[PDB]
Design a protein around this ligand. Structure first.
Ligand SMILES: *[C@@H]1O[C@H](CO)[C@@H](O[C@@H]2O[C@H](CO)[C@@H](O)[C@H](O)[C@H]2NC(C)=O)[C@H](O)[C@H]1NC(C)=O
Ligand SMILES: *[C@@H]1O[C@H](CO)[C@@H](O)[C@H](O)[C@H]1NC(C)=O
Ligand SMILES: *[C@@H]1O[C@H](CO)[C@@H](O)[C@H](O)[C@H]1NC(C)=O
Ligand SMILES: *[C@@H]1O[C@H](CO)[C@@H](O)[C@H](O)[C@H]1NC(C)=O
Ligand SMILES: *[C@@H]1O[C@H](CO)[C@@H](O)[C@H](O)[C@H]1NC(C)=O
Ligand SMILES: *[C@@H]1O[C@H](CO)[C@@H](O)[C@H](O)[C@H]1NC(C)=O
Ligand SMILES: *[C@@H]1O[C@H](CO)[C@@H](O)[C@H](O)[C@H]1NC(C)=O
Lengths: 53, 173, 108, 173, 173
């Protein structure tokens, strides 16, 4: 569906948040966009390990 | 515990304190409690900020149009442009994934090193005046108030304060 | 008697990574680099609207198909919107050479 | 010996032991011998396994057809596709080569760190009861059997066992 | 001071000595002075040479012709070849920039580690015979000439030399 909402990057699967560097979502994009991968996830650590005892 | 503490001489972490990622746990007659080391903690977190700014910003995202389409009388350009694009996609994928793995590894090493450094800072004051105990902690042959705690946090002890109390209460052991 | 100890942070959290030396590795705090999600919408760039064809082809748009709104008022736009399988090609069929090239020239 | 041992305070390695990459050498009245530290050794080797799985699998190899060919009336596509392919080839080459160099460097650091950690584990029990000697080894002011060896391997000593024998046999020195 | 010295227990560097990046500062009755540790310094600098050779040479620069040009009836090839080239340019840019940041980080860690190792080498001889002082320095309970300096540089002390002078001049403290 077409909508009045605004964006900086766009693809058939949806309009895109251009904040982050990457998607794995779909290669085709238009705008100020991420880059595509064939992967599930990418999560950098800020913190560190969690162990209670 | 790459450098010897966390899953090293230390076994695990603690959930009680939340104000900052590092600190001390003070134990004296007035009671027990946790208290965070905002100096080195904030220094480190400034490092993490400078990292992630220096990860995201190093991309340059053009005002781009990705896709194309072709007839069947230009399969050269079709299978080419497939291979071209997939080549790029895979290269970014590989470099990026190795970057996440290695950066998180170096983050663990960064933390591990910072706590190890701080452990040496704690040791550097209280070498003979107080002893290693167990793991993670030092026992005093003397007594320490909240002023003594706050002093030992910011890199101050005044070595001759309890030098003699340690020099006598050692001697039964 | 009195004692000093180190301390550091843990929490209730169960967010995880993969890492060189261990997988599903639990930490306190994390950050997802990825934008795995899409809003499922056709928003517009910047305040600049896109062009819509609805059911029309590029042929039906450019040529003046009466079932296609001409829309001379649309002087410029953000991007072009179609469906994959556009309904209204040319009512009197015919070859349309260099369809690709004209699309790329009318990319922007 | 990035972190101080191997080409550090230690000069070289040993060929006698083969069951595991790390261990101890025990010396007592019953004799001499080598014996491997399968705990940390296996932990490390699990790390190496997870590495190389996390190197090879991060590629994705398509069902590919590499090559093309052209007439001489499309030198644009010829010299292009040359430059395209050579570009890719060089980028994979450069990234891969730096990865091998850096990963092997970090492997040396991984090993070096593990042995340094273990050296601290050995020291942590036997601090005053037994002394540093030379490099790589500690001499006891007391005596130690194979049970004592096996205990000190798995992180057990019972500090008051030979506390007094060390506390007296020190005192001539 | 990732590993605890430079902006660690040490605060800052020194401008007096220029012959080599590392060394000692000797203080005795004959006077004061600085003197460089060419052994580990040259070993490290050989490492840096092997690095930068192993950075520059890992490129392969072809006898290349970069550019092209097109009509306006091949915007496919125009906007493609734009995207192609910019893709390459950005990938080299990103990989290269991360390489400079990380390599300089590992260079700081390389230096930090080398000095920390050397600090352990200095400590390893003079453990009980002489004490830690302040930061960066050890005070002797005995006296040391330029021969003693030159000996302690190259990994020689002869422990029973001033064992007794330290064993007596300690005892007032
Ligand atoms: C686009 O195509 C759809 C076909 O699905 C058109 O749908 C018709 O809409 C009219 C009312 O506008 C109905 O009377 C028909 O029964 C619908 N048919 C179907 C198959 O859905 C739609 O109108 C077209 N829109 C435009 C703008 O051309
Ligand atoms: C876009 O991403 C940023 C960062 O994750 C977030 O703060 C913001 O709310 C997001 N906006 C939308 C519309 O998703
Ligand atoms: C350190 O803490 C003590 C109290 O424990 C205080 O008197 C002193 O001013 C503090 N110094 C700094 C630099 O914060
Ligand atoms: C953990 O704590 C955070 C903060 O209180 C909360 O958002 C989250 O739901 C908690 N999770 C569980 C499993 O308790
Ligand atoms: C993580 O992986 C290890 C692999 O053996 C497994 O023991 C553990 O249960 C896993 N945990 C989760 C939460 O997947
Ligand atoms: C460690 O070894 C001692 C004997 O050397 C044995 O009694 C003890 O059960 C062992 N502990 C573990 C955890 O293997
Ligand atoms: C070390 O220095 C001493 C003098 O301080 C000298 O006698 C000895 O030969 C030196 N050894 C080496 C290997 O340079």
């Amino acid at each position: 569906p077409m909508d009045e909402c605004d964006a900086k990057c766009q693809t058939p699967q949806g309009a895109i948040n251009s904040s982050l560097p990457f998607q794995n979502v779909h290669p085709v994009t238009i705008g100020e966009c991420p880059k595509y991968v064939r992967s599930a996830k990418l999560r950098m650590v800020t913190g560190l390990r969690n162990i209670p005892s | 515990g790459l450098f010897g503490a966390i899953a090293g001489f230390i076994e695990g972490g603690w959930t009680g304190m939340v104000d900052g990622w590092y600190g001390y746990h003070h134990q004296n007659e007035q009671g027990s409690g946790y208290a965070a080391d905002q100096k080195s903690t904030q220094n480190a977190i400034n490092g993490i900020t400078n990292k992630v700014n220096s990860v995201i910003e190093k991309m340059n995202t053009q005002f781009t149009a990705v896709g194309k389409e072709f007839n069947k009388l230009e399969r050269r350009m079709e299978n080419l442009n497939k291979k071209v694009d997939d080549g790029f996609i895979d290269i970014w994928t590989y470099n990026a994934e190795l970057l996440v793995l290695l950066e998180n590894e170096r983050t663990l090493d960064f933390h591990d090193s910072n706590v190890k450094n701080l452990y040496e800072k704690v040791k550097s004051q209280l070498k003979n005046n107080a002893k290693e105990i167990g793991n993670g902690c030092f026992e005093f042959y003397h007594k320490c108030n909240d002023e003594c705690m706050e002093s030992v946090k910011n890199g101050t002890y005044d070595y001759p304060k309890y030098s003699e109390e340690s020099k006598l209460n050692r001697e039964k052991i | 008697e009195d004692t000093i100890c180190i301390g550091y942070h843990a929490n209730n959290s169960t967010d995880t990574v993969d890492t060189v030396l261990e997988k599903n590795v639990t930490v306190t705090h994390s950050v997802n680099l990825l934008e795995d999600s899409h809003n499922g919408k056709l928003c517009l760039l910047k305040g600049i609207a896109p062009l819509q064809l609805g059911n029309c082809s590029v042929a039906g748009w450019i040529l003046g198909n009466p079932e296609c709104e001409l829309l001379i008022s649309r002087e410029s736009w953000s991007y072009i919107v179609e469906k994959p399988n556009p309904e209204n090609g040319t009512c009197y069929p015919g070859h349309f050479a260099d369809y690709e090239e004209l699309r790329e020239q009318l990319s922007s």
